[PDB]
Each structure stands twice: as structure tokens, then as C-alpha cells.
Design a protein around this ligand. Structure first.
Ligand SMILES: COC(=O)[C@H]1[C@H]2C[C@@H]3c4[nH]c5cc(OC)ccc5c4CCN3C[C@H]2C[C@@H](OC(=O)c2cc(OC)c(OC)c(OC)c2)[C@@H]1OC
Length: 389
């Protein structure tokens, strides 16, 4: 009856959430191109809306699930989001209709948000010690980040080796194992009238100082959000990739993310968070500019590594400064940093792929990548105001 067990269930829950969020990336455009082979960019823009559907649904849903966890209890909605995730797995596996894909992703968003809120809530509640709670949240988020490293090569290899249905089924089997673990971990379900601070996050979002860092993360991951759906079609077109290099194309970004965060989480505190974020944004800009420069799959290993490393740079700079500013000049509560980070990520993935597809409909991929480079460069100086809050 170890608490580390519940840590394991929540860890694998959000890890599986990201893994399923990510393995869907290099396969759906293949579906759409294959179906349409037997309105050329309408499929691309509807892919962009498909990717943005989860972000929009989660953004709308998060207050509702927060209130629901406040009112009815902690154990019920995690299992509800579990069942939702299982339905999403089955719809990705067996269903092949585009509208079915939109419904599956939109449904998936609710369960993903519900897990990402309520599991963190239990992880904080059971872990009474504040420092212990903080470091366990850190390791849970580290697994959350490592899930998107696991995802893409797994999905691409199982897409090419077996077919269109095998890897979603493997993810579904992982879902069932997770649910068995969750059910066996906790036999009873309690109402859990946990007490929480009444100060909301709308005041935190209203502050420009937090908003600058939130926007920094927003565009920093809007780069990768816009990078997600365009690359597969960009490799089917004028690139003649052999239908499997998608996973090995996205892998360097993830591995660079993990190595950069792991090697700068101890250094950004020493050297300075504001200039660290400044350099991170500059590196995002230059790598994003250089992604069009590559003309072969071998070439893309460098700029993807750069953008992943720089996104890790920005995250390592900006994750602790949220809590620092919140403790300095706002309500001293835990979990609001996670809430503001989540709303920033949802914002970015809401307008990332949608605007990416909208631009790609009439403007080519090179100008898209360059222009988001200009937004990155232009946003870089605004981080200087964060040096002395
Ligand atoms: C898409 O999936 C995501 O959206 C997550 C990742 C996004 C993003 C990403 N996508 C990729 C897709 C690729 O091929 C398609 C290749 C590389 C990447 C990378 C590298 C960079 N990155 C990692 C991922 C980062 C995740 O978020 C957090 O790890 C996080 C961390 C925190 O502290 C560290 C938080 O605060 C305590 C927090 O609040 C909830 C969230 C993020 O949200 C869940």
C-alpha cells in the first residue's frame, strides 16, 4: 500500500497521455493522403484543426474538471478520464473516418486534462511534506516529458512494420494495464473534501509579469506545435521519405529536450533565468529559421536538435520563475504554477497547428518557418524586463 505506487499510476497515466498524443502525429497525414489519393490542402487544414481540437477542448474543460474535483471527489474523475482515454484508444485503433478522428481527439482532450489535474491533486495531497511534494511533482513531470521521447519512433516503427492498427492496440493494452494497476492500488473511493486556497489563477493571469513568461513558453512550444503537422506532408512532398523516417525525424528534438533540461536545471539558477530564456528564444529562432535550409533527412537532424534543445532551454528557464514570481508577489499556493503552465501550453497548441495550417494553405512552408522565426526573435527582447521584477 505504498504511496509510491500511486505515484507510479499517475506517472504512467500522464506518460501514456503524452505518448498517445504524440504517436498520432506521424500517422494521420498518411491516412488522409492515402484516402485522398484514391481540395488538396483542405485535408492539411483539417489536420491542423484536428491537432488543435484537443488543445481547445482541454482549455475549455479545465475549469469544469477543477470544479468537479473540488465538489464530487478525487478518485472518480481519474477513472472517468481513464475510460475516456480507453475510448480514444479504440477510436484511433479501429475507426478510420476523419470525423471519427476529430471526435476521438476532442474526447481525448477531456480525459487528458482530467488526469493532468486530478492526478497531480492526489500526488500533492498524499505527499504531506512540501519539499517531497515538489520533487515528486518534478519527477512526474519528468516522466511526462519522457513520454514524448518514447512516442514517435515507437509509433512510426509499428506503423511501418505491421500496419495502421497495431500500435494503437499496443497503447490500448498499456491503458488496460494502467487501469488494472489503478484499480488494485486503491480499493475504496472517498469524497475527499480537501481544503484549498480561495485565491484564483485569473489574478495571476491578469498580471503582465507572469504573462510575459507564459507567452514565452507559448511561442516557444508554438514552434514545435506548428512543426508537428507540417513535417510529414513536407516529407511526402518533394522529399520522398520512405514513410517511416517520421519517428527518427522527431526523435532528436525529444532527446535534445531531455538532455538540455537535465543539464541546465542546475545551471540556469546559477547563471540567470532571464538571460537564459533570452538565449533559449534566440536559439529557437535560429533553429526554426534553419529547418527549411535542410534538403535531406540527414540534414534535419541538426535543426530539430537545436529547436528541441532550445525549447528545453526556455522551459528550464521559465518553469521555476513562475513559482518565484507567484511566491514573491501573489498568493503562496502550490499547483497554480502547474495551472498557468498548462493554460499556456493549451493556448499555444490551440493556435499553433491551426494557424500553421492556415498559413500553409496559401503560404509555403519556408515562409511559415521563417516568419515564426521572426516572432521568436521579436519576443526575445521582452524577456529582458523579467530580469528585475
Ligand atoms: C506535445 O506534447 C506536449 O505538449 C509536451 C512536450 C512539448 C513539448 C514537445 N512536443 C514534441 C513533439 C515532438 O514530435 C512530435 C517532438 C518533440 C516535442 C516536444 C519537446 C518539448 N515539449 C515537452 C514536452 C513538454 C510537455 O510539458 C511539460 O513537460 C511540462 C513541464 C513542466 O515542468 C517541466 C510543467 O510544469 C510543472 C508542465 O506543466 C504541465 C508541463 C508538453 O505538454 C504536455
Amino acid at each position: 500500500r505504498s504511496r509510491k505506487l500511486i505515484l507510479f499510476i499517475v506517472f504512467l497515466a500522464l506518460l501514456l497521455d503524452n505518448m498517445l498524443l504524440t504517436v498520432v502525429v506521424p500517422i494521420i497525414p498518411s491516412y488522409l493522403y492515402s484516402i485522398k489519393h484514391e481540395d488538396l490542402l483542405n485535408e492539411n487544414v483539417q489536420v491542423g484543426l484536428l491537432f488543435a481540437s484537443k488543445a481547445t477542448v482541454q482549455l475549455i474543460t479545465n475549469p469544469f474538471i477543477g470544479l468537479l474535483t473540488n465538489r464530487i471527489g478525487y478518485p472518480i474523475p481519474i477513472f472517468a478520464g481513464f475510460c475516456i482515454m480507453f475510448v480514444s484508444t479504440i477510436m484511433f485503433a479501429f475507426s478510420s473516418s476523419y470525423a471519427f478522428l476529430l471526435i476521438a481527439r476532442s474526447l481525448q482532450g477531456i480525459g487528458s486534462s482530467c488526469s493532468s489535474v486530478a492526478g497531480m491533486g492526489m500526488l500533492a495531497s498524499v505527499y504531506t511534506d512540501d519539499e517531497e511534494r515538489g520533487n515528486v511533482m518534478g519527477i512526474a513531470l519528468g516522466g511526462l516529458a519522457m513520454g514524448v521521447l518514447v512516442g514517435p519512433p515507437f509509433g512510426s516503427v509499428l506503423y511501418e512494420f505491421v500496419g495502421k492498427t497495431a500500435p494503437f492496440l499496443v497503447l490500448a493494452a498499456l491503458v488496460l494495464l494502467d487501469g488494472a494497476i489503478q484499480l488494485f492500488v486503491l480499493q475504496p473511493s472517498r469524497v475527499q473534501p480537501e481544503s484549498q486556497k480561495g485565491t484564483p489563477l485569473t489574478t495571476l493571469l491578469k498580471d503582465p509579469y507572469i504573462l510575459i513568461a507564459a507567452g514565452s513558453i507559448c511561442f516557444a512550444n508554438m514552434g514545435i506545435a506548428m512543426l508537428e503537422p507540417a513535417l510529414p506532408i513536407w516529407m511526402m512532398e518533394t522529399m520522398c521519405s520512405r514513410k517511416w523516417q517520421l519517428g527518427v525525424a522527431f526523435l532528436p528534438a525529444s532527446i535534445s529536450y531531455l538532455i538540455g533540461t537535465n543539464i541546465f536545471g542546475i545551471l540556469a539558477h546559477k547563471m540567470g533565468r532571464w538571460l537564459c530564456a533570452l538565449l533559449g528564444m534566440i536559439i529557437v529562432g535560429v533553429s526554426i529559421l534553419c529547418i527549411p535550409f535542410a534538403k535531406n533527412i540527414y540534414g534535419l537532424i541538426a535543426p530539430n536538435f537545436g529547436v528541441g534543445f532550445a525549447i528545453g532551454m526556455v522551459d528550464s528557464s521559465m518553469m521555476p520563475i513562475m513559482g518565484y514570481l507567484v511566491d514573491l508577489r501573489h498568493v503562496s499556493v502550490y499547483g497554480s504554477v502547474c495551472a498557468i503552465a498548462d493554460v499556456a501550453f493549451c493556448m499555444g497548441y490551440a493556435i499553433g497547428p491551426s494557424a500553421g495550417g492556415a498559413i500553409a494553405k496559401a503560404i509555403g512552408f519556408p515562409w511559415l518557418m521563417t516568419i515564426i522565426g521572426i516572432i521568436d526573435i521579436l519576443f526575445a527582447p521582452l524577456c529582458f524586463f523579467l530580469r528585475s521584477p
